[PDB]
Every structure is written in C-alpha cells, then in structure tokens.
Design a protein. Structure first.
Lengths: 184, 100, 276, 9, 240
C-alpha cells in the first residue's frame, strides 16, 4: 500500500489543534494533496504542496518532507465542520498513474457538552402502534451494540439556543422491549 | 516572427594531415526558424552519410547544429559546406580552409 | 562550483503534414546527455552521452512518457497561441521552452530560470523569484493569468529548486569524468604571410571543455591597436571545443606578440608565441 | 529529468 | 465544472451501464476512480487526451472511451456485486496536478431486482419525560426496510426545510447483518423547544428521498414498483 494513513477515527476537542499524517513509499513522488470528504460527498481539495517545507492557508497548515517521505496536515481551532474524512494523495512521477490515494483518515471534532444529563426517553409512533432515545450524554460516552437495533451517536445544534446534544437511537419489533435499560 | 540568417564555419575536428583520417564539420548557428538544409561537398559533390547534432538553441532563441562526416583530407581535394535557409536567396557555399 | 541542468524544447507546427515536430535536448553544463524527437514510430528518450548508456529502463520509460506528455501539451499551446494572435492554420509556427537550475560551489541550489518564446521572440518569462511571470504583450497576459490561477510558478519552482537539483547531482556523479575532470586547451600559434610585409599570427585553442575560454594577443606585454579577428567558439564533435584568435603583424616583428589563454581546465593561464 | 509540470499557455 | 451522471444507480448482475462525465475546463486529463466504504479512491482508467486511454490500478470489468476532450464515459460490461461502490470522475490540467472530481455516482449491483424495496417512514413523538426534565422536545424519524442504501432524509417544518436541531445517522443499519442482500434502516433527530412543539398550528415532516427503478424497468410482482419516490411521515404540534 503506497500511500499510508491511519483510518482512525481520530477525536479532537472543538477548538483544539488536529494533526493528520501521511506517508508514501516512492521517492519519485513530486506532488502532494489533502482532500476532505464529507460523508456521501465528493473529495474537495483542502491544500496542495509541492515544495519541501511548510505551507499555510487560513486554519490549515501542511508540511512536506521529501527526505522522510511524509506529508501532514494541521487544523487550528477545529470546528464541527472539520468533521470529515481526510484523503492523502500523491503524484508519483515514476509510475504516472494520475494521483494515488491513501485509504483516508476520519476526524471527529467533539464539542464540550456543557451540562451532561444522561436520560433515556421513549417516544410513541405518531400513528398508533414506540422507539428509545439516549440523549444529553457527554462527548466521552461511547454507545454500545439480534432484534435489538442500536444506532450510533450523533450531535445536533439548536443554533438559536446555542445548545448541542449527543443522541443515539434504538428500537425493536419485540413486545418484550425494555427501553429503560436498552443501552447496556 | 523573427528571421535570422545562419552563420557558418567549416573546419576539421583535428588539424589536417594529408592522408590521415579525420572529421569534417559544418557548424551552422544563429538562425531562425529551424528548418535548414546543409550539405558537405567534396569537389562540388554532395557527400552521403553525413550526420548532425540534435537541434538545440541559444539564449537568444536562435538555433545551432553541427553537420559532420568522416573524411581523409589530401593536398588537392577541396571540401565545402553548402547551406540553404528561408533567409537565403540562394545556397551559401563556404569552402574548408584547413588553417581556419 | 557552478554546474547546471538545462533543457531546450522546440515544437514546430506542420499544417496538414502531421502533428508538430517536437524535439527536446538535455544538457549538463556544456555536455548534451539526452534527446527526444517525435520523428520515429516509437519516439523515445535516448542517451546522448556515454555515461548515460548504462541507465536502466526505469529512467527511459519515465523520461519517454514525460517527453511525450511535453510534446502533447506543446501541440495544445501551439493551437492556443494561434488563436490568441488570430493566425490561420496554413502557416507554420515555433514554440520554444528553456529552463534550468544552477548549483553554487556549495552544491546547493543557486538559481533557476524558465522562458517561453513564440516565433523566435520572448513570450512569457518566469521572474527571478520563481513566484510570478512577465508577459510581453496582451496574448501572453492571458497566459500569465492562467498560470497565476493554476499556481504554475509554484509547480515550476518545485521542479527547479528540488527535482532539478537532485538529478543534477546524480548526473554530475555518473558523468564525473566528462563533467568534473575538465579538458584544458591544447594550444599553438600558426603563421600565415598576408603580403610581403605582414603576416597573420593565429592562436589556436583545441580540445578544451567546457566552452568558456579567453584568448588574448599582447604586443610587448601590453594591449595594441591591431587587427584582432576572433572566431566563435565551435564544437569539435567529440565533446570538446575549438577557438582561435588572430592578429596581423609586421613580418620580422612576430616575437613582440604573445597569446594569453585562460580556461577553467588549466592550473594556471598559459602564454604563447609563434615558434619558427 | 524533464519537468513533471507543464504550463498551459 | 465537472458534470457526472447519474447520482444514483441500481443494476442487476450481468447488466451493463455507462456512467457519463463531462468537463467545461477543456483540460486534457480525465480519470475514473472508485471508492468502497472505509477505503480510499482507486484509479480504474484514465485518459491523457482526446483519442487516448490507459489502464489504472483496477481496470477489470470496465471500459472507457475518449472521442472528445469534454467527455469520458465509463462502461460496466457485466455488472457484479463486487462493483458496488462509489465512482468519481475527474479532470486534471497535468498528469500529476490537482484532480477536480465530479459529484459521484453511487452504484449498487443486486442479484435480483426483487430485493429492491422503498423505505417505510415513521415520525415518533417527544417523550413527555424529556419535556419536563429539559423543556426540549426530540422528534425522531425512522426509515425502515429500504434497499439499496440510496436515501436522503430531510426535515420540513411548516413545509420549509430545516437544518438547525437536526442529526441523521451517518450510515444506516442492516436489518439483517448476515445476508449480503440486507435491507436497511436510518434514524434522524429533530429537537426543538417544548414551546414550538406544543403550538398545535405546527407541522413537522420527515422526508426520505429513495432511488430505485426507472419507468423503463420491468416489474413482475404483486408488490408496488420500487420506483424513485419520496416517502414522508408527520406529526402536528400539540397543546399537550
């Protein structure tokens, strides 16, 4: 595997510096790229680097070291919008096959949950027939894993209230369905 | 679109000694554009199997080439270079002087 | 000390006689070492110095690909410049590219350069800082803007400052015997009577490398106001160079005149006199 | 080696 | 600048398929990459200029052609499940400079079109507990039993699309993790003040766009035809 990145995911606190590394095997590489990919979207170029050294643009810095065959990206003041997959790409002049990509590194920018208040609720179908919701836990709680469907966690932002909650859902078609202790 | 007319020099690789194998050179330089016809002549007759350098150019963009062949100079045989180019109304003929 | 790796690229449109002719030659200092010319079936990059004759197919496969890419883009730029200047398809045009990197005596990057020319004139020049371009006219200004938008200067600087320098090192090693072990001029004066009362003295420098040389005639170890014919330095064909410098002098007064030769290949400048 | 980078005029 | 079509596509094993890609930048170089989940882009094929093509790392199963500068279609010969993937077209100025990618084509290859179902969509109403305990009301949307995994879930609040307060699962859940042909579930949350919840003149709708068969596909089942379509669900706001 010619271009190496850790898959991660990596976690960074909102506001903190994120750092991402990429190595490549061929000293014939002459061009280097960092692409960002949002879930279900196409790669968008963040930065390009060709000369050995540091290169700066806004919150982003890149470093290229051709002697040690690595490239890196640094994101200052990580924001929720920096949560993405970061793709490393090199142009290998010895092989010429356009850009060769690493496997990508996913970055999760975690916000500080102001007032952690872990509460399991339950919610009835709006057309007779009810799901479970784990909400208001802190950004360090990790949600766990038949007929037991537990989604992964995600964070919402009530902009006008300035308020961010985590939240993870679960459901079942069984009548024997706890809810109150669904997330164990 | 610049046009520049070739400069020409005709000369041996080594100082000439009658009877002794050598190389005859014609060096055309300072011309534009690149298309050029050069022949090496023994007593007016075009020599076959003449070779030349790869086309290159100078700081001013003008081109140069070396046309050359193996030859064996004698007291009596005359040798020359003949050049045609778009800047030339007729082929220019420059005679090999072995002291130049 | 000062060494350089330079390429000279020539593309010439041939209206309805095929695609443009494209030739690329590579020099280290004053020594040609490679060439590509798209007049063959497989045009391939090929060695043109003996010290490259032992490079493997990784070098030639890459440099072939790279040269073909170069030709293709030159066909594109020839079309483009034809449009800018509103020229017909009937006429033949020339696009030329020269670039190089130089080393200092420390073995490090000292400077780089890159110029384009259309029909034998400056068109677009990379400035000394390798960060920006100079356009000669309205058409080149469009080319400047396109290069700005594309960060071409950044890309070229990366070649000139890193890649160019790395390979120039490799070449100076592989070609040390030619490139670092210089050839001093073999030097001599010939005598050619002009009239009954004057002769040409001609100071020859032969077999030298590299090309740079100085030939000077002195009368009584001092300058003169005499007829001083100097010929352009010229290739011998064998990798070396020739030059001469002639003065016409009163017959009988030849011993007053001395030829001074400076060349990097000599331990010390040499002086020279006609020997009857 | 040749430049891997080709300006488009 | 790079127009790739189509955005979604389902295919039966053995079917053939041409993805289109056009560019307006008049650049020489064009490429096709694919990307399987959790992995990077791998080059399928590329084109140095009009008239020329070249293989990439993973050419097998695929053809390309390049008549014009502008266009560079990719052609699946004989669709196979392994070719389920996201395909990205790109244009480049130089062989080794910036790739500009298209919007991508999400393609799933299924052994039988019998396996394609649209989503069933339900909106779930806020726990009263949550409303006491927080003064904040989480609506949940759940979309069930869809295949292939080609869905876009939105929230519409009084018939206008909203973003604030929303959080959708990044990937969906396999209802049966065993079966290679498993149908999928996706959850999403909208959370708003208990106040905006308990105004009865307030309409919350969970929209789920699904991509399935075309009109020109042939359907031979008592089920209704899994065409492209939106499936919605709603609640109204409640005094209590």
């Amino acid at each position: 595997k010619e271009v190496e990145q850790n898959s991660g995911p990596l976690s960074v606190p909102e506001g903190a510096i994120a750092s991402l590394n990429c190595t490549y095997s061929d000293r014939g590489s002459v061009s280097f790229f960092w692409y960002r990919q949002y879930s279900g979207k196409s790669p968008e170029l963040i930065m390009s680097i060709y000369l050995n050294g540091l290169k700066e643009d806004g919150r982003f810095t890149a470093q290229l070291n051709k002697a040690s065959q690595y490239v890196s990206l640094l994101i200052r003041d990580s924001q929720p919008s920096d949560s993405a997959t970061y793709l490393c790409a090199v142009g290998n002049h010895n092989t010429g096959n356009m850009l060769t990509f690493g496997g990508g590194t996913r970055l999760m920018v975690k916000p500080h949950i102001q007032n952690p208040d872990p509460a399991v609720y339950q919610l009835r179908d709006s057309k007779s027939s009810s799901v479970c919701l784990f909400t208001d836990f802190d950004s360090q709680t990790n949600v766990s894993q038949s007929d037991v469907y537990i989604t992964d966690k995600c964070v919402l932002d009530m902009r006008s209230m300035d308020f961010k909650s985590n939240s993870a859902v679960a459901w079942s078609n069984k009548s024997d369905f706890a809810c109150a202790n669904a997330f164990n | 679109m610049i046009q520049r007319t070739p400069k020409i020099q005709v000369y041996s690789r080594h100082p000439a000694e009658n009877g002794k194998s050598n190389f005859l050179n014609c060096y055309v330089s300072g011309f534009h554009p690149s298309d050029i016809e050069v022949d090496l002549l023994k007593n007016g007759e075009r020599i076959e199997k003449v070779e030349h350098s790869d086309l290159s150019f100078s700081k001013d963009w003008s081109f140069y080439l070396l046309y050359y062949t193996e030859f064996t100079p004698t007291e009596k045989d005359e040798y020359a270079c003949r050049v045609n180019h778009v800047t030339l109304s007729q082929p220019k003929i420059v005679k090999w002087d072995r002291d130049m | 000390g000062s060494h350089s790796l330079k390429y000279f690229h020539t593309s010439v449109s041939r209206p309805g006689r095929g695609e443009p002719r494209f030739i690329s030659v590579g020099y280290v200092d004053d020594t040609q070492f490679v060439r590509f010319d798209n007049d063959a079936a497989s045009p391939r990059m090929v060695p043109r110095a003996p010290w490259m004759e032992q490079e493997g197919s990784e070098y030639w496969d890459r440099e072939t690909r790279s040269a073909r890419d170069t030709a293709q883009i030159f066909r594109v730029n020839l079309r483009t410049l034809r449009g800018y200047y509103n020229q017909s398809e009937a006429g033949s045009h020339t696009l030329q590219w020269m670039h190089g990197c130089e080393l200092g005596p420390d073995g490090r990057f000292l400077r780089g350069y890159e110029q384009f020319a259309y029909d034998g004139k400056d068109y677009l020049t990379l400035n000394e800082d390798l960060r920006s371009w100079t356009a000669v006219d309205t058409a080149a200004q469009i080319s400047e803007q396109k290069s700005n938008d594309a960060s071409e200067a950044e890309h070229q600087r990366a070649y000139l400052e890193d890649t160019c320098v790395e390979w120039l090192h490799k070449y100076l090693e592989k070609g040390k015997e030619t490139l670092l072990h210089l050839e001093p001029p073999k030097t001599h004066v010939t005598h050619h009577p002009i009239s009954d009362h004057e002769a040409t003295l001609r100071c020859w420098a032969l077999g030298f490398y590299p090309a740079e040389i100085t030939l000077t005639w002195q009368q009584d170890g001092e300058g003169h106001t005499q007829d001083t014919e100097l010929v352009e330095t010229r290739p011998a064909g064998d990798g070396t160079f020739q030059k001469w410098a002639a003065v016409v002098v009163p017959s009988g007064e030849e011993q007053r005149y001395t030829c001074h030769v400076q060349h990097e290949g000599l331990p010390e400048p040499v002086t020279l006199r006609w020997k009857p | 080696i040749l430049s891997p980078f080709l300006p488009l005029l | 600048g790079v127009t790739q079509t189509p955005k979604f596509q389902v295919l039966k094993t053995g079917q053939s398929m041409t993805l289109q890609c056009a560019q307006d930048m008049n650049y020489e170089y064009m490429s096709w990459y694919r990307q399987d989940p959790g992995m990077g882009l791998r080059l399928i094929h590329y084109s140095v200029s009009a008239g020329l093509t070249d293989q990439g790392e993973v050419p097998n199963g695929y053809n390309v052609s390049r008549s014009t500068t502008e266009d560079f279609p990719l052609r699946l010969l004989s669709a196979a499940p392994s070719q389920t993937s996201v395909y990205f077209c790109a244009s480049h100025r130089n062989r080794l400079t910036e790739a500009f990618f298209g919007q991508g084509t999400r393609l799933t290859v299924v052994e039988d079109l019998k396996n394609v179902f649209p989503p069933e969509v339900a909106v779930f109403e806020p726990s009263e507990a949550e409303i006491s305990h927080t003064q904040k009301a989480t609506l949940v949307c759940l979309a069930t039993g869809f295949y292939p995994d080609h869905v876009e879930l939105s929230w519409w609040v009084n018939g206008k699309e909203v973003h604030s307060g929303v959080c959708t699962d990044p990937q969906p859940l396999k209802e049966q993790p065993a079966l290679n042909d498993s149908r999928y579930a996706l959850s999403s949350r909208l959370r708003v003040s208990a106040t905006f919840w308990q105004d009865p003149r307030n309409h919350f709708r969970c929209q789920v766009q699904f991509y399935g068969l075309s009109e020109n596909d042939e359907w031979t089942q008592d089920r209704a035809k899994p065409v492209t379509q939106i499936v919605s669900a709603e609640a109204w706001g409640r005094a209590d």
